[PDB]
Amino acid sequence: LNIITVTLNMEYNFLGISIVGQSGGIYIGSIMKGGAVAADGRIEPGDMLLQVNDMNFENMSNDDAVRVLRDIVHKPGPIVLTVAKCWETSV
Amino acid sequence: LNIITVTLNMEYNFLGISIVGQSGGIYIGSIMKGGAVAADGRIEPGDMLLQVNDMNFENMSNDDAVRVLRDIVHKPGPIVLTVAKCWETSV
């Protein structure tokens, strides 16, 4: 059970994450210093973004996901992100 | 056509990449300074690793992929990585 929810107040205009697509979730490439996500601390590079508020990406195209995510980030008020926590190892 | 091949001489004992799994390819989380991958330059964080030499991960479990990758990195001689180049944007 590696999925967590992360609520951000956004009282912030920008999540401060770089998201990565490839030509069932969106990968988080990096976290931009300050916040909102950096200020919260729970989301880390390599985590997979599955949902924002009630809009789930697991069956959306990457282009629609980004569009919906931006639409919601530009709405007033708090946002809830659902994240799959990654594992990492070096080779 | 966003897939490239990257040959590394490995005359290096360590690719110098952190790979990310989640509970058809393995994501590259970061690149460790020096090389081999850092020294080559073509592979970047967010890229997806699809194959090493002739062993393709697109139908393997993440745990088998990592195992096979380590096995091959510990073999003598050059290694060929097949990478899907990501796109990135900030939200």
Q: What is the CATH number of the domain that holds A10?
A: 2.30.42.10
Is A11 in contact with B72 (CB distance < 8 Å)? no
Domain of residue A89, residue span? 1-91
- Contact between residue B50 and residue B57 where contact means Cβ atoms under 8 Å apart: yes
Burial of A31 (0-12, 13-18, 19+ CB in 10 A): buried
For tokens 């990758």, name the residue. Answer: B69
- Which residues of chain A does B29 touch, with a Cβ-Cβ cutoff of 8 Å? 45-46, 86, 88
Q: Does A70 touch chain B (CB under 8 A)?
A: yes
Q: Is B52 on the interface with A (CB under 8 A)?
A: no
Question: What whole-number distance in Å separates Cα of residue A49 and Cα of residue A33?
Answer: 19
Query: How was this entry determined?
Result: X-ray
Q: Is B25 on the interface with A (CB under 8 A)?
A: yes
With CA atoms as reference, report the closest residue to B53 among B83, B81, B16, B76: B81
Nearest CA in chain B to A16: B91
Q: Which residues of A touch B2 (CB under 8 A)?
A: 22-23
Distance from first CA to last CA of chain B, Å, rounded? 26
Number of domains in chain B: 1
| Structural element, H or E, at residue B67 | helix B62-73
Sign of CA dihedral B1, B24, B65, B39: positive
Distance, in Å, from the CA atom of A55 to the CA atom of A74, rounded to the nearest integer, reads 15
Distance between CA B45 and CA B80 in Å, rounded?
18
Give B70-73 contacts, CB < 8 A, sequence gap 24+: B70/A91, B73/A91, B73/B10, B73/B13, B73/B14, B73/B15
> Which residue from B45, B91, B55 is spatially nearest to A67, judged by alpha carbons?
B91
CA neighbor of B24 nearest in space, from A6, A24, A61: A24
User: Taking CB atoms and an 8 Å cutoff, what residues of chain B touch A15?
Assistant: 91
CA distance B56 to chain A (A): 17
- Enter the tokens of residue A69: 């995510």
Counted residue by residue, chain B has a size of 91
**Phi, psi torsion values for B87, nearest 5 degrees:** -115, 155
> Does residue B19 sit in helix, strand or coil?
strand
H or E stretch at A86? strand A86-90
CA–CA distances in Å: residue B20 to residues A39, A71, B45, B47, B91: 23, 28, 10, 11, 21
